[PDB]
Ligand binder design. Structure first.
Ligand SMILES: [K+]
Ligand SMILES: [Mg+2]
Ligand SMILES: [Mg+2]
Ligand SMILES: [Mg+2]
Ligand SMILES: [Mg+2]
Ligand SMILES: [Mg+2]
Ligand SMILES: [Mg+2]
Ligand SMILES: [Mg+2]
Ligand SMILES: [Mg+2]
Ligand SMILES: [Mg+2]
Ligand SMILES: [Mg+2]
Ligand SMILES: [Mg+2]
Ligand SMILES: [Mg+2]
Ligand SMILES: [Mg+2]
Lengths: 49, 136, 114, 49, 50, 136, 49, 114, 114, 114
């Protein structure tokens, strides 16, 4: 939503002017964060951990 | 403008019909029925002669810097004229707080049309149809 | 070990524009918040006499003692002075115009404890 | 123009005058607490020292 | 903060709210609302009932 | 036309005041605050320069053939300008989706009066008071 | 109201003197502050708020 | 017995590159955080007139009083000054270029308590 | 990081008006609340001898040692001195008029710790 | 009543050994822990130009304004200067060798608050 404003100083009998609540968005665009690791079968067998 | 009824003076009702009633700030002291133009941002001052300076007529007396109401176009109005006006005369500001005919001014088009004729210094009934500003 | 930053003083100034051909600026320590003043700079838009006065009144000027410190000639600045005055000692500094017309006087310094 | 305040401020109504008058400066009143108070029997009298 | 120097109310106000005369139809006040430079009025201490 | 409040840009509300809001069909894709003129029967397209082509301003974004709401004369509007406008300047369509002054244009009468001044590319506040069609 | 003043010292059987409450006024001149907005019926239906 | 280290209070500087033949650097105490300044150094890439001004306005220079302190000739440094200016006393220092072309001006000193 | 503003000194002055042809102003550190004084300024309304004295009594001047520091001539100001005196060292400064007629004398300085 | 002991400053120095026939020592206030410097002593093993510069970058010297303060001939000491520079004003002091052979340069002063 738009910021709050100050009401307007006006004459008598004058039109009340429009300054309506105005809207926008922030767009999220979720980015795929990825991580890989590869290990050989002999490595997996021989390692202590 | 004002109306004598014996010993009494009465204010003249500027607005005959219409709803073009819009808020501005007075750039000087303004009186009811006085023609005005934009002198600053939403700020209005008394019109000068020969056109290019008209937004509306001041509805009530105001001091400098106070919020003013104007009748703009599509208002029928009671206004004071500096010369004889007949019906169907086009009028614009005279620069004297009053109106004159297009025919008398150096301008070629008006801002109001006289519905009810008046002598010099008296109240005509007119319809506001245009605004005039800076064209160079 | 304990490390503090020192701001070097509290400022004081008196100024007058268009002080007439025989008129003066009265530098009054009662205008200082700490009660005493030390004028370092006198900038003078023409010739001036500098006068130091003791008053016989605690708050008004009623001349008890007076000494003309110096006469400055022409437009310029005197800087690095220590002309000193306070309320409780009833001391005033007067800068008197001696030029053949009006001048501007700016005096600056710092406040000192009463 | 139509009927409005600035036209008829002193002809169709009176500007309000507030029903409450607002107080001036009040001086601090302490003498009775701040001293020995004698409610004297006589306008003139003596205290022995 | 609501109970300092004998005062019993703190009225925290915004930077924007004083009339600097930049908004349309608002005719600016005499002072500068702020606390940054000479003549800046940064606080007012007062009687709420006056 | 758009407004900045921090990092955010907001769509400007084209209409400040007025009730002269009228239905047409879009002859092309139109954007909010765009000056428009009659291109066919109850059909409006974006105005070219130098006058003779103004009915009002487009109140929201439309594709070609879609129903447009138009603000006519009697509307106070937030509109974008291509040059510096002072209050009391007359403005008319630029041909570029914007308004320019009568002084700059090859025309000699405008369609709106500037109530709040603005720089080039900024949003003025204007009152629409006239229509321009073809005169030959 | 005027500020509180101080009673006057007086002889006995002597005329009491007058320093009654004197008055003044503070003016107010309220300005009309106005705000407006407009919404279409279709917007009012469709909006999540 | 209590021992304290004194570091001197805030450095102050104003500078301009390529100031034109009749233009000026205006040293404004509003730029200091303590509100008041003492100028020790004026470095000039050509001849300059130094002028001390009082304003009639609290925030902008609208000249009330003006004194030309001195004129410096050619390129160089003036050091060991105590030219004094304050925002609350509305004093400003103007260094005006008087060379037949553009120069560089750097002024330095320290902030003093207002 | 902690920042302190330094206001200098506590003010000190002694003065006399119309001191006669061979009489004196006795500047006495007993009048300083810190017990000791450093005198910067001697304003003299005529010719004066400056004399520095130790007293053999704690409270009154009974001369033990005396030295004439300098002789000033005419009406004028001597400033930026550091003439120095304290009560526990029983030191007094005497300014003696040598003008052959009555003069005004103003001395100023600051208090120093005893 | 409270008595404190004042230890002055924090020490600042820049030095170069055998700076070449036309090269320079760049004194940078970023090397000081308080971010501003006041140079008092310049010792030079031969003739030098002293130059005061403002940078257009917050961290590196990219010349904006430049003034040659003075030129020192021969070998010796300049003392009691107050050449001042700071990091957030991006001020710099350059000592340029003009002797036509290799020289040693030592600058000393103290740190000042930013
Ligand atoms: K119309
Ligand atoms: Mg808004
Ligand atoms: Mg309307
Ligand atoms: Mg006194
Ligand atoms: Mg006293
Ligand atoms: Mg008795
Ligand atoms: Mg002030
Ligand atoms: Mg009687
Ligand atoms: Mg009374
Ligand atoms: Mg100021
Ligand atoms: Mg003793
Ligand atoms: Mg003893
Ligand atoms: Mg930097
Ligand atoms: Mg920085």
């Amino acid at each position: 939503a738009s910021d709050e404003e100050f009401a307007r100083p006006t004459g008598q009998g004058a039109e009340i002017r429009d300054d309506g609540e105005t809207y926008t968005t922030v767009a999220w665009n979720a980015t795929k964060l990825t991580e890989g690791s590869r290990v050989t079968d002999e490595m997996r067998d021989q390692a202590m951990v | 403008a004002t109306e004598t009824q014996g010993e009494h003076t009465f204010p003249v009702e500027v607005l005959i019909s219409g709803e073009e009633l819009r808020g501005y700030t007075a750039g000087e002291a303004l009186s009811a029925g006085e023609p005005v133009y934009l002198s600053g941002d939403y700020e209005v001052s008394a019109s000068s002669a020969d056109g290019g300076e008209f937004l509306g007529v001041n509805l009530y007396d105001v001091a400098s810097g106070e919020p003013v109401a104007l009748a703009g176009d599509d208002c029928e109005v009671r206004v004071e004229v500096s010369e004889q006006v007949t019906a169907n005369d086009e009028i614009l500001p005279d620069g004297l707080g009053t109106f004159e005919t297009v025919a008398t001014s150096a301008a070629s088009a008006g801002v109001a049309i006289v519905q009810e004729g008046a002598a010099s210094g008296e109240v005509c009934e007119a319809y506001i149809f245009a605004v005039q500003g800076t064209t160079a | 070990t304990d490390t503090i930053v020192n701001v070097q003083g509290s400022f004081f100034s008196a100024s007058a524009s268009g002080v007439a051909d025989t008129e003066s600026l009265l530098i009054d320590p009662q205008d200082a918040k700490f009660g005493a003043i030390e004028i370092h700079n006198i900038a003078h838009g023409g010739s001036v006499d500098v006068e130091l006065l003791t008053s016989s009144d605690d708050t008004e000027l009623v001349e008890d003692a007076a000494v003309t410190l110096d006469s400055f000639t022409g437009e310029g600045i005197s800087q690095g002075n220590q002309i000193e005055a306070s309320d409780n000692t009833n001391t005033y500094i007067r800068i008197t115009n001696t030029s053949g017309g009006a001048i501007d006087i700016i005096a600056t310094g710092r406040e000192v404890s009463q | 123009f139509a009927a409005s305040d600035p036209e008829y401020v002193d002809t169709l109504f009176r500007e309000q005058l507030l029903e409450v008058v607002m107080e001036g400066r009040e001086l601090r009143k302490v003498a009775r607490e701040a001293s020995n108070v004698i409610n004297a029997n006589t306008r003139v009298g003596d205290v022995p020292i | 903060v609501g109970d300092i120097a004998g005062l019993d109310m703190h009225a925290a106000m915004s930077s924007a709210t004083y009339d600097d005369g930049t908004d349309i139809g608002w005719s600016g006040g005499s002072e500068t609302w702020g606390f940054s430079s000479d003549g800046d009025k940064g606080a007012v201490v007062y009687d709420r009932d006056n």
